[PDB]
Design a protein around this ligand. Structure first.
Ligand SMILES: Cc1cc2nc3c(=O)[nH]c(=O)nc-3n(C[C@H](O)[C@H](O)[C@H](O)COP(=O)(O)O)c2cc1C
Ligand SMILES: O=c1cc[nH]c(=O)[nH]1
Length: 338
């Protein structure tokens, strides 16, 4: 059995960098339609990233991005069952503010909220607003994140912090109310330091799916994460990111994938800098008939450590509908749904 989440398009054109891919702005109403349809099909969770600078080109790729906490606060108000995760770019928000924002969305959602904590990697997202700490941050960023999460855990657990470190000084810091349920923390650590952080402080770790139609190719990453979790004695599973391009036949899905690769927005791809393609940032891609994708997702569910998948689509509104109507009913790992 495996959990399914939707990675909501908080940035324009989702995860395809192509003039032949669907062209759309991230609105609230689009993300509302996506999350309500996901909830209707018993998706377990919805997550938004945070992306503070785009890649330009013909498609202005990720030049247009909403902010994650405010988006997910709006989505929490128009849902009732799906788990809601927002991403904190921890260089941009003081931990006491994230603590209070999480208590707030806990109140909006009736205990369905969690936080994805990221260090940030892309210097320009931070340099552009004068808040990059310097190139020491590449090596020290999980030290920073360790202090950050200690402040969050004090505030959510007791309502107060006296934490004092290299990066934070709390003098009887107060945040109440405390969340109604234990606050879920997720991390997207791929490095040794990142997985060591996740093993100590996260409920689950997000990793990248790998290759095109090689669903189990990420297995060594999920194995590293299981070894990290052994070092803390904590149950910290892997949720794996894939793009699904499904149709009625294998040949039809392959034709769509090829059509997207042929439109690659090369100018946007240079800023960024059966194989994976830069057209979806070399994402793990599952391309097939509804039945072929259901079989491949059942193979993901068999990989040691894999507890769920985070899904993008080529078209979210039609991709969620065909997932719910044609793919999910054939998945052995979703036989637990009503
Ligand atoms: C599903 C997923 C979501 C991510 N979201 C973001 C994000 O919103 N913002 C960001 O700066 N980095 C994000 N990242 C980058 C991770 O935090 C990334 O794997 C990490 O920065 C690289 O691993 P390392 O930090 O251990 O080297 C994401 C990664 C994954 C797998
Ligand atoms: O940095 C990011 C954010 C979302 N999706 C990715 O593949 N990378």
């Amino acid at each position: 059995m495996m959990k399914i989440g939707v990675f909501v398009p908080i940035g324009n054109n989702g995860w395809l960098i192509s003039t032949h891919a669907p062209q759309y702005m991230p609105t609230f109403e689009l993300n509302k339609a996506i999350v309500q349809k996901a909830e209707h099909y018993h998706f377990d969770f919805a997550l938004s990233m945070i992306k503070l600078r785009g890649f330009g080109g013909k498609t202005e790729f990720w030049d247009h991005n909403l902010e994650s906490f405010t988006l997910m606060a709006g989505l929490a108000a128009v849902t009732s069952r799906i788990q809601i995760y927002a991403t904190a770019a921890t260089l941009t928000l003081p931990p006491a503010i994230v603590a209070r924002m999480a208590a707030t969305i806990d109140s909006i959602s009736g205990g369905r909220f969690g936080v994805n904590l990221v260090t940030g990697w892309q210097k320009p997202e931070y340099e552009q607003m004068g808040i990059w700490p310097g190139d020491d941050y590449f090596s020290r960023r999980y030290d920073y994140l360790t202090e950050y999460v200690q402040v969050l855990r004090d505030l959510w657990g007791t309502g107060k912090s006296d934490f004092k470190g290299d990066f934070f000084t709390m003098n009887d810091c107060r945040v109440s109310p405390q969340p109604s349920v234990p606050m879920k923390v997720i991390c997207a650590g791929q490095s040794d330091a990142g997985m060591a952080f996740s093993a100590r402080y996260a409920d689950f770790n997000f990793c990248f799916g790998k290759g095109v139609n090689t669903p189990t190719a990420f297995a060594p990453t999920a194995a590293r994460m299981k070894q990290a979790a052994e070092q803390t004695g904590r149950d910290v599973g892997s949720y794996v990111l894939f793009m699904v391009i499904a149709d009625e036949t294998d040949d039809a899905a392959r034709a769509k994938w090829e059509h997207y690769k042929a439109g690659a927005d090369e100018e946007a791809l240079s800023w960024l800098t059966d194989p994976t393609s830069a057209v979806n940032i070399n994402m793990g891609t599952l391309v097939g008939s509804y039945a072929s994708v259901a079989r491949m997702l059942d193979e993901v569910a068999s990989v040691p450590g894999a507890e769920g998948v985070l899904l993008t689509f080529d078209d979210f509104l039609s991709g969620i509908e065909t997932f719910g109507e044609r793919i999910q009913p054939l998945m052995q790992c979703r036989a637990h749904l009503p």
